[PDB]
Write a protein that binds this ligand. Structure first.
Ligand code: CFM
Ligand code: CFM
Ligand code: CLF
Ligand SMILES: [Cl-]
Ligand SMILES: [Cl-]
Ligand SMILES: [Mg+2]
Ligand SMILES: [Mg+2]
Ligand SMILES: [Mg+2]
Lengths: 478, 519, 519, 478
């Protein structure tokens, strides 16, 4: 490897000396240094394993992956956090999966519906309480299109059968009532929640309009895996519709049960988040013969590449439309590079997020002249690590399911100019004097997808990297 | 599209013509209910008819105003020196506790899990405890590892005491590390219950076999319970120093929740020391400042430490601060400091100066049981009417005491108290009872929005006092207890009145006959 | 009409149908301009063409942002122990000075006049001065009677010094009473000039014959100038105590402007003592904290007391507070206290936590020269853009310094500085330059109202920082200097941004896609 | 006198003992104890004399009486505070003389127009500046109906001639430009400013429409001397119109130049503030043969008396209308008295205000069973004290131009339950533990005139006298 790769291998060694010998050996398999001649990670890294006990993993649980990520954004359904009160309260409106509607009336994403388990429910089971809750839900929220039941930890442990309740209640209400066994003890992270949720959509939603007439066009597509953080999916959909495509569905940012049921009628599935929804895309290819492709709408290089590749799946009219859309936004893109690249170029970034963004945003940083010196994921699988390798410079530190100790030690040693990570990481690194942008919530900004999102992303990296307060952490008498 | 000179974030980007058109086109693919039907249903949700149906609920909870036990244990644990909160169970819980406190305090929050998974569901979580204590000790070097539990651990019945003994005997965690524990089932009570349970575990660990003697130290201990205003820990210490009465707060997270941004990350800062907790039984007494939630802590004080546990009301407002200082004076034998009497008189001066805007104003309020009782009391003392009073996690004994206090007051005649009711209940009450203002936490913003959508005449503005406060910055630094905190409350209430009156009288040529310069 | 169960005050009483009918009928007797014409003129007053004509004014002033000299002499005088402010001249002035401060501080304000009328206009006011000193002494028993003047006394040429010398000679004022004086003509400068002039009068009376020796006392004097935030006097004393550096404020009205409501009226309370003023020449140095207005006070310190008069910037913001503490440390030889470095780091944490809502925000601001320079400097330090900066009473030398500071900052590129301009000039600048927010005093409410009448998109909300603050209560208790004051400023600015963003995103079904719970 | 009278006469002697001899003897003639068989004060009290130097009188100046009180309220005129900047700034929007309009465009009461005298204006005179000021005003404020020039102390002292300026500018503008020599050193208090202003109105406004067509009715009236504090004049106007009268003009609360110019065409002048506007009422009687009468719209007893006397100047139709209006509000009145009288009955009130209210509000207090134990005025004349005598109980302390010292001493000895006075008195007496209501600005409430105002008055007296904070001035351990 190069001199960076060597410094990073020595750093891995030095950081892991703190761990008890067993954990140390185990953790050494979760980090590596990139090689531009490598097409696949092979044995260089492992991932999607259990977290080490007690190390302060960043990871969440399967309910976060199912309720928090995949189903919670669907605006026309009511999602029940079924179990004790915590899970639903902590995840109430924490994720900025934007949608339009009238809250509590035709759209329900900011309400927290829960069965608020008490000891009586643990002792006698919660299925009767769940059935009565669903009756009260229908009386008070009549315009729901469907209801989901998001299991928390106790539900499967006490032996409840929410699928029996969902079947009975669906008949009673004559609306889809969908049971999800996404108890947080399952799996190792948010990731199994995604997979669980995709299997539930496969069985309980996707076949609901099978055999029915549906008026198609030759250019029908679905956005698969964009949760519209700060309106990211709207900033993506606009480009696809400007290119002459009809976006029949968006999964699941600003999404609806209806759109999901109409997804089997499209011509092409466009997968943005591969980790969370590749499962259902593969299922639609095998059952419905709908092709799918991965794309990336972060920054001008990736956007143009994506628009051209998506348009190449259709015909010359859509191919010409892709060139027209790219030409239409080229002046905006040139102005953004001219104003912000000189303020950011040369600066070094460390990224740590969940399962997509740690690789996906690299192009946009590179468009602004920045360099990624380390990238990690909370819960990605080795096929995500494989997909990260083409966008890393040789010797970059690449790592998986880091503890807070390990992130802090990497930051202290590597001295990135800017960090992109989450809310639990933000206030630690700011106190260490490192500019920090939340790359899950967009630090209450965004969108970052699309052409309109690239302007905001550039504005935001400059605002934070170059803020005058970073020159004031040391008192002037020290 | 975007212009280079003025880039618009999400709002107001999506207000642009191209995005309004995009939304019209997407709406055609959603099978949206018709706009008149949605309007009809929204109007229906604001009625008394809907409210009666809403108040028939037995199983569904909507927009709860409480959180689960371990959250409270974590906060308790953060208040001790060199302590690492550790929650035995499933990891999702710990990501959420950290994030919830991160967004209120704007600060890092240290807390670990031992990541119990399906394997631990079958065999018990003993291996996770052993490895979790060893790895946590190695990476974070705590003096105290303060263990609580998630609901998975509770359902499966892991024996915490036995696991922790087995870890030390087997060499997974050094014997010099203190490892207090508490069972904190999220299906019992709420986050305030967790805090009290965690405190009982610290008291057992540090004092079980101690031969204490009350008054051997001429000090008073103070126990705050679950409290998320930094200024309340600090004002108690400041008033005790003015009283010249030695004091320890037992659980004080106010330094670890406010470390400086000076180029260093400090996982640990300040907090109750082991010496303060170990010598707690030798104090004259321990004052439990949020009495409705400090139930097991009162049993510690009286049964384990043989101290009075002198009853004190939450020290919120003028009269309740007076009573706290008279109690401190009686127990210590020291006179109330002249600086405190001067501060008291300045609060009374503020009250007299602002009373014409507060008298007769109607408020809705919700929160934890101790806080709601305290703030209801002070509102009555101001001549305000707390007409709608809700505490989701309160019990019938608390509700009886509340109605007793209200019935005795000239200002409690139109007051209704609700327990085991949530914010979807509170939302209906804001529509039907229409107080002038509501006092709540950031979840109340949705109710304010809902009431405004009925019309400007129906809007009930939110005043943020409580937890969590996620949509304004640095309110967590404030004080709400003592004379200092009552000054904050008075100023916040009066200026909320005056801001709304200015907004209502700010329509040029229409309502600005009353847009007075001087108020 | 009124109903017994809900009596309405003026607003909203006059919204009732019978009053709307009354107004439509009364309008027919006024020969009102038609609504279309009034609309056309209002719109024209928002334009760039109207602005150009508005900035051609050479004789008309509209909505000034300054007051007159004797107001500031009264406030300086209130800062000395057992001192009765006395304004030689016409009594209407004293009714207005008292009222003006009564409405900002919500407190009583002692001040007398000697009631010169037409007789004194012809004979000069020496008889009024004799009887006035005699009657004020008898009634109010001050230790010090601090005399300033009204414009009548100035125009007629009353020889103040001679009058007081005659009152003393003839036994109208006893030798136990000190009678410092200053000429304070309202047609020169503004209220800040009167404060500085009054301070020079106190310096002559208490120190002119004293043979001082700088550093004989190991202390620093601090001079605030005209300042109406009680917290600014208090924070300075608290920081000096933490530094362990003896200090006196010379003019400190914070006790007499905050006496307790305990059943007693106290005309005098606290204040700089005669001992403090008389021993001021023996300090190491005197620090003039508002340097632009403390012009004669600087000559006192250097020419009378032979002290350095070490230059200091107004201690507003992070860097200016660091510079004040480094100056105190250098002059005293004492290190900066660890508690102050801790507080500094918590302010920096706040700045980093809130920076994404403040960066790039555009502000208009107005006020007195020292305050506007300090607040502009701190806004630049936050990465805000102070685009419209106005000080009605600032001079050309101040303007040159402001432009030098702004030229040297990346955040000052679009800033424009206006002196000798008023709030009608500011109103046009809010319409044409439209900053996000404007920082001002209660007179800025009318400019917010005017901008909202053009449309919701054009509204510039007011953030209240300055004097006078008449339409909110108890903001005069706050602090704006030091780290403590900068924490108030940062919190105030970011929560104004967030309150405005919530309001903008609070329309159910329309803009509430971005009504985020967490910000 | 009676026992109460003797205690007050002894209190007078004790209070004045502190005064130097000269002042002591002079001050003694400004206080007395009332006798119910007395119809005139005669030699018993003196008033409208200079104030004693140095004593902290409550009084203001003639500019306050002219600009602040009489002219300031007129909404459709621009009023220039002419002189240095203080006067106009301290009096900017202090007095709640309500009006409706579009600020800065067709109504100007909250703007502060001033000529901001600087040293060069004192040395060289201000007339050239004033003339230029008025040109600039006409350019930027084209919709004024007229302009007034309110002189501050320096103007006359430096020998300026604002009348010449006003005549020249009026010709150039083709609008009334009204010069007022209301310099604050003239006279002894606010009172001479009233008188100056009435004389100015007489000569520069009142004759502007002589001989011009005006369509009358038999029941045309003007409200003379109601400055609409908190909307008081609107709450009075409504009753007069309900009784079938046409209120052609309101002087000057919500008033206009046009209304004032039409006042010589009314049938009856209705004087509420006798002190400030009796001069112009007498003048209109002499010159235009318009009868005038004093009335009182504070509380139901005085309102009924006034409605009946006003209606007795007309015909049987208005007499019947007076009865019908009183009957229509009887229920409202009885419910206010039944709710608030029991909370206030028997409490004792000290009143200290300008020139009218100290006697005018007594009936309203008596309607809630309250008793006045002391009443004084800042600047009233002996005809005002004459007019106070009918409404005092024997032995009541009646006093004139009290110093702060005297008012504090009176309050400490009398121990009123409630004080009504001004803003400079408010925060002193509250710290002394005495409930206080501002009875100039109505403590930001009102209106207090008329039937709608009586309800607000009662609510407000109860609110403050019975507030729970008054039992907390002494710490519980003392
Ligand atoms: S941490 Fe995405 S695989 Fe999942 S909530 Fe964030 S890097 Fe998730 S891109 Fe997505 S919208 Fe996310 S940011 Fe895949 S959905 S479990 Mo936390
Ligand atoms: S103090 Fe009226 S003679 Fe004049 S401003 Fe108040 S008791 Fe005046 S009633 Fe009136 S509206 Fe007044 S309340 Fe005659 S106008 S100089 Mo201060
Ligand atoms: S891993 Fe995930 S978030 Fe954790 S519980 Fe399990 S589904 Fe839920 Fe829940 S109520 Fe509280 S937060 Fe837990 S202890 Fe239970
Ligand atoms: Cl309870
Ligand atoms: Cl200056
Ligand atoms: Mg919709
Ligand atoms: Mg922080
Ligand atoms: Mg006060």
């Amino acid at each position: 490897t190069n001199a960076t790769g060597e410094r990073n291998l020595a750093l891995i060694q030095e950081v892991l000396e703190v761990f008890p010998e067993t954990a140390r050996k185990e953790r050494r398999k979760h980090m590596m240094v990139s090689d531009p001649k490598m097409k696949s990670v092979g044995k260089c890294i492992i991932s999607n394993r259990k977290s080490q006990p007690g190390v302060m993993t960043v990871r969440g649980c399967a309910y976060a992956g199912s309720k928090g990520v995949v189903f919670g954004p669907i605006k026309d359904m009511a999602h029940i956090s079924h179990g004790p009160v915590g899970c639903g309260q902590y995840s109430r409106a924490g994720r900025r999966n934007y949608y339009t509607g009238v809250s509590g009336v035709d759209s329900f994403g900011t309400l927290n519906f829960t069965s608020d388990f008490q000891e009586r429910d643990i002792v006698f089971g919660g299925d009767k309480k769940l059935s009565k809750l669903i009756e009260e839900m229908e009386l008070l929220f009549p315009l729901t299109k469907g209801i989901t039941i998001q299991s928390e930890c106790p539900v499967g442990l006490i032996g409840d059968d929410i699928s029996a309740v969902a079947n009975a209640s669906s008949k009673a209400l004559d609306k889809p009532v969908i049971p999800v066994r996404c108890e947080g003890f399952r799996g190792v992270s948010q990731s199994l929640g995604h997979h669980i949720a995709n299997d539930v959509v496969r069985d309980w939603i996707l076949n609901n309009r099978e055999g029915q007439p549906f008026e198609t066009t030759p250019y029908d597509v679905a956005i698969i895996g964009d949760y519209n953080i700060g309106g990211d999916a709207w900033a993506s959909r606009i480009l696809l519709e400007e290119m002459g495509l009809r976006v029949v569905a968006q999964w699941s940012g600003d999404g609806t049960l209806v759109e999901m049921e109409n997804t089997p009628f499209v011509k092409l599935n466009l997968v943005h988040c591969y980790r969370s929804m590749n499962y259902i895309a593969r299922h639609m290819e095998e059952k419905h013969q709908i092709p799918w492709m991965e794309y990336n709408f972060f920054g001008p290089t990736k956007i143009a590449e994506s628009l051209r590749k998506i348009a190449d799946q259709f015909d010359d009219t859509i191919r010409a439309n892709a060139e027209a859309v790219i030409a239409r936004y080229e002046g905006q893109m040139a102005a953004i590079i001219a104003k912000y690249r000189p303020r950011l170029e040369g600066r070094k970034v460390l990224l740590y997020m969940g399962g997509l963004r740690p690789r996906h945003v690299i192009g946009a940083y590179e468009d602004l002249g920045m360099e990624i010196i380390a990238a990690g994921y909370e819960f990605a699988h080795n096929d995500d690590y494989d997909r990260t390798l083409p966008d890393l410079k040789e010797g970059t530190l690449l790592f998986d399911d880091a503890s807070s100790y390990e992130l802090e030690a990497f930051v202290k040693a590597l001295k990135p100019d800017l960090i992109g990570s989450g809310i639990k990481e933000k206030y630690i690194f700011q106190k260490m004097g490192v500019p920090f942008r939340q790359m899950h919530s967009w630090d209450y900004s965004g969108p970052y997808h699309g052409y309109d999102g690239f302007a905001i992303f550039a504005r935001d990296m400059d605002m934070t990297l170059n803020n005058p307060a970073w020159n004031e952490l040391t008192a002037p008498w020290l | 599209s975007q212009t280079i000179d003025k880039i618009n974030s999400c709002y107001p980007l999506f207000e642009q013509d191209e995005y309004q058109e995009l939304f019209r086109n997407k709406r055609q693919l959603e099978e949206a209910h018709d706009a008149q039907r949605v309007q009809e249903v929204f109007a229906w949700t604001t009625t008394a008819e809907y409210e009666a149906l809403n108040f028939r609920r037995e199983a569904l909870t909507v927009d709860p105003a409480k959180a689960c036990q371990p959250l409270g244990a974590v906060l308790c644990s953060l208040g001790f020196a060199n302590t690492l909160p550790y929650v035995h169970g499933s990891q999702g819980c710990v990501a959420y506790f950290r994030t919830y406190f991160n967004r209120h305090f704007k600060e890092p929050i240290a807390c670990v899990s031992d990541s119990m998974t399906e394997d631990a569901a079958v065999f018990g979580g003993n291996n996770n405890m052993n490895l979790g204590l060893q790895n946590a000790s190695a990476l974070y070097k705590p003096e105290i590892i303060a263990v609580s539990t998630t609901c998975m651990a509770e359902v499966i019945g892991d024996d915490l005491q036995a696991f922790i003994a087995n870890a030390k005997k087997d060499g997974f965690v050094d014997s010099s590390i203190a490892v207090p524990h508490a069972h904190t089932p999220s299906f019992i009570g709420s986050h305030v219950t967790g805090w009290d349970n965690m405190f009982e575990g610290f008291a057992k660990t540090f004092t079980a076999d101690y031969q204490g003697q009350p008054g051997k130290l001429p000090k008073l201990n103070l126990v705050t319970g679950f409290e998320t205003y930094l200024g309340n820990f600090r004002v108690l210490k400041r008033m005790m120093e003015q009283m010249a009465v030695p004091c320890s707060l037992l659980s004080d997270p106010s330094e670890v929740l406010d470390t400086p941004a000076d180029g260093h990350y400090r996982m640990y800062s300040g907090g109750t020391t082991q010496q303060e907790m170990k010598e707690a039984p030798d104090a004259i007494d321990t004052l439990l400042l949020q009495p409705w939630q400090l139930l097991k802590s009162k049993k510690v004080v009286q049964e384990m430490w043989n101290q009075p546990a002198t009853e004190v009301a939450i020290p919120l407002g003028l009269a309740a601060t007076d009573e706290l200082l008279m109690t401190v004076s009686q127990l210590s034998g020291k006179p109330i400091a002249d600086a405190l009497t001067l501060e008291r008189g300045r609060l009374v001066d503020m009250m007299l100066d602002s009373h014409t805007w507060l008298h007769g104003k109607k408020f809705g309020l919700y929160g934890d049981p101790d806080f709601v009782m305290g703030l209801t009391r002070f509102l009555l003392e101001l001549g305000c009417e707390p007409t709608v009073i809700l505490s989701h996690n309160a019990n019938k004994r608390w509700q009886k005491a509340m109605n007793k206090m209200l019935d005795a007051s000239p200002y409690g005649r139109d007051s209704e108290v609700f327990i085991n009711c949530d914010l979807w209940h509170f939302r209906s009450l804001m529509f039907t009872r229409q107080p002038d203002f509501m006092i709540g936490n950031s979840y109340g913003k949705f109710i304010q929005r809902d009431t405004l959508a009925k019309g400007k005449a129906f809007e009930v503005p939110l005043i943020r006092l409580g937890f969590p406060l996620f949509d304004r910055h640095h309110l967590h630094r404030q004080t709400t207890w003592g004379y200092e905190g009552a000054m904050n409350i008075v100023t916040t209430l009066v200026n909320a009145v005056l801001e709304k009156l200015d907004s209502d009288t700010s329509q040029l040529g229409k309502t600005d006959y009353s847009f007075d310069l001087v108020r």
